[PDB]
Design a protein around this ligand. Structure first.
Ligand code: T2D
Length: 297
């Protein structure tokens, strides 16, 4: 595959930093006016990470429709994702409101509530079934139905209810717990095992709203996850891994949200995951169980 040759080429000349910095230089620049309004200062976790006005998700409420989230619509691949920051103590209600209004089925969390001794995300979901959460502001109820804890990730079945209409929906929460901030997965096997788990749940299917993906800022780890998934989907459509230009795809994604993929090594890891994942797309069913093994699930 073209990417495989390119990989060795860059790896040989050890120029990932140069390749990565080039993408940053070419990346799109669009207005983030709403995000910067004074009334929204307390709705942003990082002053330097904001959603573009053109692709930001709007909450369905007259008061304030702002939430730090972006709709990444990949027209070519035919899949959309909503990338957002880890919710703040005051935006947990906004977060579930977004999940409801956008009709999402799954939520992918790639960070931990606490990392490097600091709080990177609010405890926005219930940890015990007996203690449901109620969000007054958005009038939503959230209950833990069950959870399947594994070595490095946990899958929870949640029940989201619109207290206004009393409708109920099943939300699946996929939590990757071993992906360090500004870091990379333990191995592509571990990452791919997790991605396919999300895929097998139907959370990424077009019959549901876009899956919600987030880490702390919603650009680094979240970008890596989406880049890998989109690239695998593309070569799957054509059944031709050579037709995928990883850098072009990343640049296309960056038209919807700034700074996707935060380090040169996260870019390098992306190449590894996609090249590895190609094995499955090309008809090798056995590698999935191979990944499950190596992942030390
Ligand atoms: O790897 C990373 C680095 N991130 C980040 C990006 C900007 C500020 C703070 C943290 S992320 O939470 O988007 N994932």
């Amino acid at each position: 595959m073209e990417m495989e040759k390119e990989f060795e080429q860059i790896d040989k000349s050890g120029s990932w930093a140069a390749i990565y910095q080039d993408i940053r230089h070419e990346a799109s620049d669009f207005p983030c006016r709403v995000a910067k309004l004074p009334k929204n200062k307390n709705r942003n976790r990082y002053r330097d990470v904001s959603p573009f006005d053109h692709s930001r998700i709007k909450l369905h409420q007259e008061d304030n429709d702002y939430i730090n989230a972006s709709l990444i619509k990949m027209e070519e691949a035919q899949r959309s994702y909503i990338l957002t920051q880890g919710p703040l103590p005051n935006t947990c209600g906004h977060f579930w409101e977004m999940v409801w209004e956008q009709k999402s089925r799954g939520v992918v969390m790639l960070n931990r509530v606490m990392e490097k001794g600091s709080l990177k995300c609010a405890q926005y979901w219930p940890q015990k079934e007996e203690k449901e959460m109620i969000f007054e502001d958005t009038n939503l109820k959230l209950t833990l139905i069950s959870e399947d804890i594994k070595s490095y990730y946990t899958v929870r079945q949640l029940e989201l209810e619109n207290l206004t209409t009393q409708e109920t929906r099943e939300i699946l929460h996929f939590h990757y717990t071993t992906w360090p901030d500004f870091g990379v997965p333990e191995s592509p096997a571990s990452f791919l095992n997790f991605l396919f788990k999300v895929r097998e749940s139907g959370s990424l299917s077009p019959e549901h709203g876009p899956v919600v993906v987030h880490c702390s800022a919603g650009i680094g780890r979240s970008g890596t996850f989406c880049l890998a998934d989109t690239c695998l989907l593309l070569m799957d459509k054509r059944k031709d891994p050579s037709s995928v230009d990883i850098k072009k795809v990343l640049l296309e994604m960056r038209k919807f949200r700034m700074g996707l993929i935060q380090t040169a090594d996260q870019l390098r890891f992306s190449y590894l995951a996609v090249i590895e994942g190609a094995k499955f797309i090309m008809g090798d069913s056995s590698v999935q169980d191979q990944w499950k093994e190596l992942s030390h699930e």
